[PDB]
Amino acid sequence: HMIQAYLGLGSNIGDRESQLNDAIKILNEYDGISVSNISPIYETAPVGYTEQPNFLNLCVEIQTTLTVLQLLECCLKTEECLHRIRKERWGPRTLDVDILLYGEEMIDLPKLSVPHPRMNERAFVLIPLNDIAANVVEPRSKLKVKDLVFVDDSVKRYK
Numbered sequence: 001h002m003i004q005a006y007l008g009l010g011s012n013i014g015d016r017e018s019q020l021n022d023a024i025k026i027l028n029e030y031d032g033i034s035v036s037n038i039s040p041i042y043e044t045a046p047v048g049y050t051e052q053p054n055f056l057n058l059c060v061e062i063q064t065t066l067t068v069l070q071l072l073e074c075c076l077k078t079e080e081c082l083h084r085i086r087k088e089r090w091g092p093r094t095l096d097v098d099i100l101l102y103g104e105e106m107i108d109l110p111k112l113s114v115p116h117p118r119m120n121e122r123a124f125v126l127i128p129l130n131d132i133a134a135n136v137v138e139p140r141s142k143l144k145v146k147d148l149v150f151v152d153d154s155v156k157r158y159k
């Protein structure tokens, strides 16, 4: 039996599209993970530290038998595979894999918050998330993604 989870992927260093593509393939190769839906890719202005490169962002749905901590390990291992060397949270990265939703579960461990606690004010998450999960309930707000998503001109269709 599998639980439905959603991941946010980002890249703003190098050949961003190729790195995201590789990330999806790698994620789909872990035992206990199947990629089951893929959002469109958006080009997005960097949020937070603005003196860094524009991002490509997408969301994916996965079906998984992994626990949320095992899932996190696989997310972090995927980043290592794509040669993420920088670990400054504010700084650029070859690949970022964030757990956005893990069924309707909520957790706020010192080093792990799901639903991702910043997702609701990030167009670069919500726009691609809405593309694939418009009717999914975000458990903190208890609103559907389609009732959270908002227009943002800094988020542009890429692919």
Ligand SMILES: Nc1ncnc2c1ncn2[C@@H]1O[C@H](COP(=O)(O)CP(=O)(O)OP(=O)(O)O)[C@@H](O)[C@H]1O
Binding pocket: 072, 075, 076, 087, 088, 089, 090, 096, 097, 098, 099, 100, 111, 112, 113, 114, 115, 116, 117, 118
């Ligand atoms: N929902 C989540 N998904 C992935 N990592 C999370 C997380 N909640 C907390 N973390 C923590 O954040 C660490 C990963 O660091 P980074 O990826 O460098 C932060 P970031 O993705 O730039 O910021 P963001 O998570 O606000 O988008 C993980 O080692 C983990 O302990």
Ligand SMILES: COc1ccc(C(=O)CSc2nc3c(=O)[nH]c(N)nc3[nH]2)cc1
Binding pocket: 009, 010, 011, 044, 045, 046, 047, 048, 049, 055, 057, 089, 090, 091, 096, 124
């Ligand atoms: C102080 O206010 C903030 C601090 C940090 C942030 C972050 O989002 C985390 S770093 C980061 N990740 C991405 C991303 O995937 N896509 C885009 N487009 N921009 C990003 N920036 C936002 C606001």
Ligand SMILES: [Mg+2]
Binding pocket: 096, 097, 098
């Ligand atoms: Mg991250």
Ligand SMILES: [Mg+2]
Binding pocket: 010, 096, 098
């Ligand atoms: Mg992130």
